[PDB]
């Protein structure tokens, strides 16, 4: 619809003026399955990694936040076994004025600062809290394997 234009504008800006560490590859025929890559931010267990995700603008978008999925296997509290990403702040604070650039920046932030309260990976959530050195070593080891 006319939303297609609004996203075409933002996505085109995203490819031209990309956020640091984030590259967006939309197919012009498919502007609702956005292939994205996030580099593991320096200082995180994911440093040096290349993380392929897909951003799925839902049917109720942009009144509900888009759903993000990691294609790269990752050990992260907010990522499920299918690769699903849970950004609770986005769920809780979502308004239409939040651009796609914001979602992608938020997902990048979550890699740096997971949220164990709403963890899809229980074990990662526990480890982040109970034994941090062990969560970081596993996230780092799995980054080396799949990053």
Swiss-Prot record:
It catalyses: S-ubiquitinyl-[E1 ubiquitin-activating enzyme]-L-cysteine + [E2 ubiquitin-conjugating enzyme]-L-cysteine = [E1 ubiquitin-activating enzyme]-L-cysteine + S-ubiquitinyl-[E2 ubiquitin-conjugating enzyme]-L-cysteine. Pathway: Protein modification; protein ubiquitination. One of its GO terms (cellular component) is nucleus. GO terms for molecular function: anaphase-promoting complex binding; ATP binding; ubiquitin conjugating enzyme activity; ubiquitin-protein transferase activity. The active site is at residue 86. It comes from Homo sapiens (Human). The chain holds residues 10 to 156 of 222 of the full protein. This is Ubiquitin-conjugating enzyme E2 S. Keywords: Acetylation, ATP-binding, Cell cycle, Cell division, Nucleotide-binding, Phosphoprotein, Transferase, Ubl conjugation, Ubl conjugation pathway. Component of the APC/C complex, composed of at least 14 distinct subunits that assemble into a complex of at least 19 chains with a combined molecular mass of around 1.2 MDa. Within this complex, directly interacts with ANAPC2 and ANAPC4. Interacts with CDC20, FZR1/CDH1 and VHL. Its EC number is 2.3.2.23.
